[PDB]
């Protein structure tokens, strides 16, 4: 009932993100470093967990 053409439209903004391990921020998926300054611009990034 979600009509998965729209779910793939919805998953880009919510699900297809990368998470910093330190500061838990919601980062773009192909980014290398965290944009937040409080964690020292780290390169220790993990994917967001899929449902």
């Amino acid at each position: 009932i979600i009509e998965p053409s729209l779910k793939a439209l919805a998953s880009k903004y919510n699900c297809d993100k990368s998470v910093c391990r330190k500061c838990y921020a919601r980062l773009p998926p192909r980014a290398t470093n965290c944009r937040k300054r409080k964690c020292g611009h780290t390169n220790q990034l993990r994917p967001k967990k899929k449902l």
């Binding site: 009932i1 967990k49 899929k50 449902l51």
Partner: protein, 128 residues
């Protein structure tokens, strides 16, 4: 035995009679279908095991006459419906599955939850 009737609670309408009921009675009880398996994102990782409930909490009935205005108008792959006079969530239609709380699978189901509807006998009084 005698015929039975399913009346809606707070609507008081006979939603479905007997000569119905694809009841599918025995569960599977083996490890893959009697158990509820909750997988993870990758590599078929099992995180949760849920044991099935005792009794199947639904009523699997044929497509009836009063569902015809809901089934034809905006036909989709899943949804719900109501009593025809109180508009409360009584049962849903699913062409997929939704086994039972107790679990097998069925065919496409018209699942009618045994909460907020009850089962009566259509015959005369018991006279206790």
């Amino acid at each position: 035995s005698k015929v039975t009737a399913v009346r809606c609670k707070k609507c008081r309408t006979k939603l479905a009679l007997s000569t119905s009921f694809i009841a599918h009675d025995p569960p599977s009880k083996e490890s893959s279908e009697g158990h509820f398996i909750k997988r993870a994102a990758n590599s078929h990782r099992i995180i949760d095991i849920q044991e099935s409930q005792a009794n199947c909490s639904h009523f699997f009935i044929e497509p009836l006459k009063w569902m015809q205005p809901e089934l034809q108008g905006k036909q989709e792959l899943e949804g719900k419906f109501s009593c025809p006079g109180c508009s409360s969530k009584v049962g849903g239609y699913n062409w997929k599955g939704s086994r039972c709380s107790c679990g097998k699978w069925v065919i496409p189901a018209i699942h009618l939850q045994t909460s907020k509807v009850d089962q009566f006998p259509l015959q005369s009084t018991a006279l206790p």
